[PDB]
Amino acid sequence: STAGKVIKCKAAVLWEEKKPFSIEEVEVAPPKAHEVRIKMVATGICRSDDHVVSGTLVTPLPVIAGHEAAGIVESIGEGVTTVRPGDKVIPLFTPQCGKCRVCKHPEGNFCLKNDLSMPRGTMQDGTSRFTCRGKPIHHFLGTSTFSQYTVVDEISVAKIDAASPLEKVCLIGCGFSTGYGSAVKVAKVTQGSTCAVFGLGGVGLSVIMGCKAAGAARIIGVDINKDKFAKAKEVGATECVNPQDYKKPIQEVLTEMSNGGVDFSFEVIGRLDTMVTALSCCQEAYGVSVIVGVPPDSQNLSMNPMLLLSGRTWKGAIFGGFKSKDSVPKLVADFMAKKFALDPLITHVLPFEKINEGFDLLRSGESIRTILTF
Amino acid sequence: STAGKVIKCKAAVLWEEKKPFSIEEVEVAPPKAHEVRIKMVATGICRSDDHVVSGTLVTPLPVIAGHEAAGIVESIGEGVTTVRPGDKVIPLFTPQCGKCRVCKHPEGNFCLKNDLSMPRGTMQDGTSRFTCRGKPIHHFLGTSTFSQYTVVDEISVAKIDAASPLEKVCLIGCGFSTGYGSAVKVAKVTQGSTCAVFGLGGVGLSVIMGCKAAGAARIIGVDINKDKFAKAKEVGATECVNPQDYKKPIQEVLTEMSNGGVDFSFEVIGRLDTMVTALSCCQEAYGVSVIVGVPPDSQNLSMNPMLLLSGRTWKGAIFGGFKSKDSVPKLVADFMAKKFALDPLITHVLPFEKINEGFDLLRSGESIRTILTF
Numbered sequence: 001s002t003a004g005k006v007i008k009c010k011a012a013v014l015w016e017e018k019k020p021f022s023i024e025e026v027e028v029a030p031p032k033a034h035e036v037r038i039k040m041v042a043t044g045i046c047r048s049d050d051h052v053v054s055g056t057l058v059t060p061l062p063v064i065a066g067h068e069a070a071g072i073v074e075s076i077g078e079g080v081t082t083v084r085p086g087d088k089v090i091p092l093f094t095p096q097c098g099k100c101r102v103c104k105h106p107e108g109n110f111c112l113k114n115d116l117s118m119p120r121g122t123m124q125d126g127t128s129r130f131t132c133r134g135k136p137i138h139h140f141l142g143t144s145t146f147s148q149y150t151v152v153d154e155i156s157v158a159k160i161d162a163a164s165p166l167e168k169v170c171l172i173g174c175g176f177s178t179g180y181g182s183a184v185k186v187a188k189v190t191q192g193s194t195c196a197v198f199g200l201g202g203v204g205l206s207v208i209m210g211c212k213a214a215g216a217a218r219i220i221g222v223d224i225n226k227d228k229f230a231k232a233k234e235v236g237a238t239e240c241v242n243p244q245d246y247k248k249p250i251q252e253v254l255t256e257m258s259n260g261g262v263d264f265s266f267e268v269i270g271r272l273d274t275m276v277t278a279l280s281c282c283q284e285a286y287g288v289s290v291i292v293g294v295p296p297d298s299q300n301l302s303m304n305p306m307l308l309l310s311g312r313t314w315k316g317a318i319f320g321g322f323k324s325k326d327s328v329p330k331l332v333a334d335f336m337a338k339k340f341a342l343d344p345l346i347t348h349v350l351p352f353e354k355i356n357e358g359f360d361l362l363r364s365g366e367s368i369r370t371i372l373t374f
Numbered sequence: 375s376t377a378g379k380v381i382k383c384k385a386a387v388l389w390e391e392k393k394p395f396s397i398e399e400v401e402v403a404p405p406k407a408h409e410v411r412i413k414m415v416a417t418g419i420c421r422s423d424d425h426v427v428s429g430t431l432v433t434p435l436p437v438i439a440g441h442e443a444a445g446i447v448e449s450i451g452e453g454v455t456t457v458r459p460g461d462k463v464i465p466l467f468t469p470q471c472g473k474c475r476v477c478k479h480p481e482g483n484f485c486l487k488n489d490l491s492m493p494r495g496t497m498q499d500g501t502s503r504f505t506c507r508g509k510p511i512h513h514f515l516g517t518s519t520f521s522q523y524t525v526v527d528e529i530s531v532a533k534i535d536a537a538s539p540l541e542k543v544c545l546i547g548c549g550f551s552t553g554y555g556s557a558v559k560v561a562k563v564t565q566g567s568t569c570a571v572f573g574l575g576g577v578g579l580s581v582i583m584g585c586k587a588a589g590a591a592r593i594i595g596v597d598i599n600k601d602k603f604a605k606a607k608e609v610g611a612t613e614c615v616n617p618q619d620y621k622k623p624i625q626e627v628l629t630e631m632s633n634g635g636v637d638f639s640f641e642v643i644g645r646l647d648t649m650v651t652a653l654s655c656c657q658e659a660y661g662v663s664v665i666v667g668v669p670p671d672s673q674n675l676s677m678n679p680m681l682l683l684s685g686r687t688w689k690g691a692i693f694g695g696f697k698s699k700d701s702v703p704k705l706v707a708d709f710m711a712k713k714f715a716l717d718p719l720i721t722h723v724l725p726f727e728k729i730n731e732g733f734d735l736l737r738s739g740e741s742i743r744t745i746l747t748f
């Protein structure tokens with residue numbers, strides 16, 4: 001029995017930037033009021049977790065990272081009403097409190113209880129449930145999935161179908177939903193349109209899936225790693241271009257290819273230059289560009305606002321625009337109903353102990369998603 | 375009769391940046407095929423005409439500026455089918471060719487035949503209809519309304535109601551339509567929302583009118599010239615704020631005032647800094663900001679894309695998003711049916727010969743719109 005007791009378990013601790021994860025024993029406190037302790041089953045390696053290592057994405061260290069995952073509830077704190085022990089769940093890196101102005105807005109999803117804007121790396125109550133070698137360890141986005149057990153706030157967990165395959169649906173916790181929603185909800189890609197997708201990793205492939213679902217006629221993948229092209233075509237790209245193959249800037253290439261600019265463009269990398277390029281390549285009077293990638297902390301881009309004055313729309317979003325707790329279970333149900341595919345995103349499956357190897361696969365260009373199994 | 379003949383008339387020629395207009399005789403060629411020569415009746419002084427003087431808006435010199443006007447057709451070239459001699463007309467600074475991909479798109483209005491993006495200062499055929507002192511003079515936006523007579527391409531003129539009061543409806547040729555459409559068409563302001571409007575000149579006042587028409591609950595006018603506040607309130611502002619009165623940046627003030635950010639913001643000035651401030655003051659997850667102001671040529675702004683990644687939408691537009699030739703006659707009909715007011719924009723009236731005094735009135739902060747009568 002573990003309910004009400006501290007659990008000692010293995011986690012991947014990041015003690016400082018630019019170091020391998022350290023796989024070692026941590027102590028996980030029991031859940032307090034309105035908290036949920038989860039036994040992890042599978043977690044994906046998202047580029048954002050690597051951004052924590054590289055210092056691209058700032059959050060308090062030391063930390064237990066990981067945010068794209070699925071597990072089974074081990075215990076619940078007082079007052080919890082939306083999940084029970086034994087339920088399959090996905091942790092929600094964007095909460096859904098249901099009560100703030102954003103949660104009440106028809107479009108909004110970036111709940112004001114999030115820990116992304118100004119990261120504290122705690123539970124909602126400002127404390128941590130993790131200790132390692134006697135030291136407190138920070139949480140990450142209210143999730144912290146690189147651990148056999150984590151504790152999350154109730155507003156940061158969704159109950160999902162008891163029959164779902166957790167080694168696949170963990171991707172609904174971040175990369176799939178982000179990319180798919182960026183196309184279908186944020187951009188609202190139209191039938192017959194031309195899309196350009198910058199970055200052909202797990203998120204960008206999920207953008208392609210959304211553009212195809214929305215009926216785009218042309219979906220142009222853009223990546224500097226041509227090894228990414230074959231899979232991009234399998235999931236719906238009609239053409240792929242590598243900017244390094246061209247003498248001219250790729251915005252000019254894409255404008256030419258699309259006979260004056262694309263309908264929808266997506267930045268799914270995290271570079272300031274590609275954000276401006278992606279905006280520029282959409283048609284100047286009616287084009288829409290969506291920023292998805294997370295760029296280096298504290299860095300500003302430079303752009304000419306004439307790009308907007310002509311008529312372009314520029315937007316960004318977190319988690320594909322989906323209200324997290326409402327959307328995650330529906331997306332799992334949609335997966336179980338064969339409405340989209342997750343296998344094309346999964347290139348590697350490793351035990352959790354091989355987390356560093358999984359990160360090396362990402363960094364080398366070789367993987368899309370590695371799924372770590374506990 | 376003057377049909378087929380060169381007309382000698384007075385125009386305001388701008389020979390050099392940062393100098394007064396020179397009111398002197400020009401020669402106006404007769405219209406070629408698919409061209410229309412117009413006897414001007416009234417023209418407004420828009421800030422964009424001053425931007426030509428100041429070099430903020432680059433267009434070839436020497437030039438006949440003016441783009442917000444109404445007149446009566448003097449003669450038509452071969453093949454013209456949409457207007458006849460004697461018709462009241464408004465020149466269209468954004469053409470509507472009807473044939474390009476933008477004109478065919480449901481949302482687009484920045485027709486590819488425009489002379490705004492890369493100005494040539496000519497008719498569609500690349501030539502000029504104006505000479506002064508024996509020297510060919512450039513056109514401006516295909517309109518050149520600071521002249522007793524002008525020649526425009528047929529795609530750059532709309533026929534309007536024969537009973538239209540031209541000394542009022544000239545404002546439909548630029549400032550009214552721009553501001554109004556920016557609110558009702560581009561932003562799509564919703565009932566009960568909170569709007570912030572930066573800049574309370576003719577265009578900003580027209581944005582306020584559109585936000586009021588859309589049913590906004592709060593419309594916060596922002597201007598460094600507090601003399602602009604009274605009229606802003608008259609046309610619908612619920613509150614006005616002067617950034618100079620505050621020790622904190624106005625984005626912070628506006629976020630506080632709106633309990634977490636406004637629903638819709640509009641930059642109606644032309645400054646890079648206020649474009650970034652206006653974006654920032656809209657709610658981070660679901661806010662929309664529209665750039666309307668024209669900023670100094672070739673200058674880039676600097677911004678942190680996290681402002682977009684949280685969920686904001688940033689867009690700009692020319693002419694309020696309106697397809698010009700379809701919309702102008704309908705806007706005039708709406709004016710004639712008292713659906714909106716133009717008198718609140720008209721603070722001064724002068725004869726055309728006093729154009730330089732009209733620009734002085736604008737530059738001093740004293741006027742909204744001065745209407746010049748021929």
Ligand SMILES: NC(=O)c1ccc[n+]([C@@H]2O[C@H](COP(=O)([O-])OP(=O)(O)OC[C@H]3O[C@@H](n4cnc5c(N)ncnc54)[C@H](O)[C@@H]3O)[C@@H](O)[C@H]2O)c1
Binds near residue numbers: 201
């Ligand atoms: N907005 C969100 O809610 C959200 C959620 C998930 C991921 N993210 C972000 O989305 C981005 C993509 O994540 P991912 O997991 O798919 O990453 P990834 O690393 O698997 O894919 C990025 C792709 O970009 C390509 N690339 C890198 N530099 C490039 C360049 N200069 N030009 C063209 N292509 C380039 C790479 O070759 C790679 O294929 C990351 O920045 C991540 O942090 C955002």
Ligand SMILES: NC(=O)c1ccc[n+]([C@@H]2O[C@H](COP(=O)([O-])OP(=O)(O)OC[C@H]3O[C@@H](n4cnc5c(N)ncnc54)[C@H](O)[C@@H]3O)[C@@H](O)[C@H]2O)c1
Binds near residue numbers: 420668
């Ligand atoms: N997008 C379009 O199609 C379109 C068409 C018309 C006008 N324009 C542009 O819209 C803008 C407004 O035109 P207008 O005729 O109303 O001009 P205007 O000069 O009458 O009004 C601008 C207002 O901005 C205020 N202002 C100036 N600097 C400010 C600052 N730093 N902070 C706050 N307020 C400030 C002024 O006091 C003034 O009242 C101009 O840049 C013009 O070129 C664009």
Ligand SMILES: [Zn+2]
Binds near residue numbers: 096097101
């Ligand atoms: Zn909330």
Ligand SMILES: [Zn+2]
Binds near residue numbers: 046049068175
């Ligand atoms: Zn992620």
Ligand SMILES: [Zn+2]
Binds near residue numbers: 420421441549
């Ligand atoms: Zn104007």
Ligand SMILES: [Zn+2]
Binds near residue numbers: 469470471473
């Ligand atoms: Zn056109």
